[PDB]
Ligand binder design. Structure first.
Ligand SMILES: *[C@H]1O[C@H](CO)[C@@H](O)[C@H](O)[C@H]1F
Ligand code: NA
Length: 442
């Protein structure tokens, strides 16, 4: 494959508001489901919360300094709905909009294109009190929030994503209970998935009407390429079920193909009520799709397990990070599939990276060679994808800096920059210097 990326390729790093900002009560911010969840004893592995995190509400200028030192040309970050509409449904908080306005101006002044995520999991708690993503009304008010934000910032921000990883919000938040709000019911999770998709579609339409200029609007999906452990009917069916559970359940309705019928049959009475009107809304045309990629699923049939009755067959020969199996070829596979089998284009890699047991060494650096190798290998797969015609326009490393990693708290470090959570000092890791020098060469 090729050596060089396009001259106008987007090179960035990514964060999310609750994971980095802190300042959870400042300047009118409301309570989010992640404030409630992280303050519930036992939900976070290490007793931490997002109360301070990286203090990026006050220290985003330091984050900009890091992006500049890395030679990036873009920054993917989220806007906290609790800062914009603290009650979820209700009046706006101009102080919240002004904060992000200043941030956007600081990014543009630095030559960093803002790639804004509207929803990165921090649902206002008052909406969860009224069933959260279990209620259609949450979709409606999400679109109202999207309208307000674009009205004020859309003169400067062209590239917007509605949702980050609706599979996580629905299935981890309402079915498996490991993410906020922490419910454990399949029917509620599937209902949440529909109202997330509906909220996405309503927001796209609202954003286009509210925008002062044409916008490039996408959605961001985690995708897991799935492979049967054997060619038996049982294992192949398990792979199809897992592929439907994570990938096709979201890709198909967004593509105007309805929900996948095999999954509707498998889910039975737990499937949501989806009329043709909702599906037309959900398929609101998009300008790009964001792909979040870390891992494959090598599936074996698991009849006694919870739905989708498919377990991972571990490969001890493959490298593992602090929390995941490394399989770079899956990134090529999933992109080839999107390019040839689905209508979304162009594509951005909106999240890719890894977690390691990073420490500051005696010399002062962070020697994260496995993370450097992770980036090198995945970037090579992107060159293969580009060679095959995949319309890939950018890449965002997850994450700019170590941050609050959801149910694992501050204990799971994904940064290309190290965060000292006691002093708030950031330091570039060796992999970040590698990205800097690779990008500079491009
Ligand atoms: C994508 O995955 C990373 C690692 O688990 C999370 O920190 C991000 O919030 C999620 F969008
Ligand atoms: Na390892």
């Amino acid at each position: 494959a090729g050596e060089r990326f396009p001259a106008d390729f987007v090179w960035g790093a990514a964060t999310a508001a609750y994971q980095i900002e802190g300042a959870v009560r400042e300047d009118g911010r409301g309570v989010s489901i992640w404030d409630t969840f992280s303050h519930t004893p036992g939900k976070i592995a290490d007793g931490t919360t997002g109360d301070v995190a990286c203090d990026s509400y006050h220290r985003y200028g330091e984050d900009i300094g890091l992006l500049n030192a890395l030679g990036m040309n873009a920054y993917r970050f989220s806007i906290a709905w609790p800062r914009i509409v603290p009650l979820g449904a209700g009046p706006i908080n101009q102080a919240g909009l002004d904060h992000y306005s200043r941030m956007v101006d600081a990014l543009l002044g630095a030559g960093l294109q803002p790639f804004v995520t509207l929803y990165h999991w921090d649902l206002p708690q008052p909406l969860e009190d009224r069933l959260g993503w279990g209620s259609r009304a949450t979709a409606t008010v999400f679109a109202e929030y999207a309208d307000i934000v674009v009205r004020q910032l859309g003169d400067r921000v062209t590239h917007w994503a509605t949702l980050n990883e609706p599979w996580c919000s629905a299935m981890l938040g309402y079915y498996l209970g490991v993410h906020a709000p922490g419910h454990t019911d399949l029917k509620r999770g599937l209902e949440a998935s529909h109202n997330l998709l509906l909220g996405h579609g309503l927001a796209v339409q609202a954003m286009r009407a509210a925008a002062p200029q044409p916008l490039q609007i996408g959605i961001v999906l985690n995708l897991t390429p799935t492979y049967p452990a054997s060619d038996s009917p049982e294992d192949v069916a398990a792979a199809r079920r897992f592929d439907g559970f994570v990938n096709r359940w979201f890709l198909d309705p967004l593509a105007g193909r309805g929900y996948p019928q095999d999954m509707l049959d498998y889910y039975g009475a737990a499937a949501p009520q989806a009329n043709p009107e909702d599906l037309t809304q959900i398929a609101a045309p998009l300008d790009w799709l964001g792909v979040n990629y870390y891992e494959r699923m090598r599936a074996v049939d698991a009849p006694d397990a919870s739905l989708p009755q498919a377990q991972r067959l571990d490969d001890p020969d493959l490298p593992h990070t602090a929390d995941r199996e490394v399989y770079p070829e899956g990134l090529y596979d999933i992109l080839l599939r999107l390019h040839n089998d689905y209508p979304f284009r162009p594509l951005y890699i909106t999240e890719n990276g890894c977690a390691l047991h990073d420490e500051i060494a005696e010399d002062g650096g962070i020697h994260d060679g496995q993370r450097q190798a992770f980036f090198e290998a995945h970037l090579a797969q992107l060159q293969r994808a580009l060679a095959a015609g995949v319309p890939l326009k950018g890449y965002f490393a997850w994450s700019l800096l170590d941050n609050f990693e959801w149910a694992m708290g501050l204990s799971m470090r994904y940064g290309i920059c190290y965060t000292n959570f006691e002093t708030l000092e950031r330091r570039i890791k060796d992999s970040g210097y590698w990205l800097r020098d690779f990008i500079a060469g491009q």
